[PDB]
Amino acid sequence: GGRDCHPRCTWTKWFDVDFPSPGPHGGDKETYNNIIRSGEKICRRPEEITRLQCRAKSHPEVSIEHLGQVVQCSREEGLVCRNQDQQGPFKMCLNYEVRVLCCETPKGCP
Template structure:
């Protein structure tokens, strides 16, 4: 039988053997739209489409996460502002004046001016094809994956004259195809080692 081992990327390995760093990178705060307070059909639209329209060099291979804040109240959570705002990792920020009511931090039924920061996957083919779509604006998961599988039977480590104490645990492993398919579905480099 064979044992498949997942080997994590090492920061100091040579470039020929390392998988690319696919950790998303946060942009600076972006503000390309300003709400028109005299127009109920206006609002603040910090959408990816508007950002690209404003700066044709802006590129985000894949938005993994997004952070939104009011420009004049950067330390106040959006939920505490009393405004109806959509902060979405797939589109950006949308605030419509017509959705606002008097109350909250501003006594006017118009959108505040917002800004966003986006955590973008690097524009590297290996990173773009290996990521999966995010469905929430939760922080990105860590880059470390843990794979576990049940042992069929085990025996306690027993020191022998040829083995130092505590160095071995005998175990019967599930078929190698089970281990291979489990580990292959995780992130990282996969190496096959004879058992």
């Protein structure tokens, strides 16, 4: 047809709505649920979450694996880190942040 129909995609800002506290039930839960309930906007209504990125807030360039940290960065949910999953004897998550790629397909497009 006469239109470029590939999705238009825009990254959100980075969100950091939770901060870890110590103990076996602490962690850092940067889920879309928590982000929205913190007053933050993620995507607009027409757009769909297409990609998630995750990083340590105060160590933004490093692979999280090199910190020995056990985290999940899932497109459906956001980032979850649980203190109980980390190595001891001080079992604790670092502070993470996330950002989202929001994509919207133009009108009348397969």
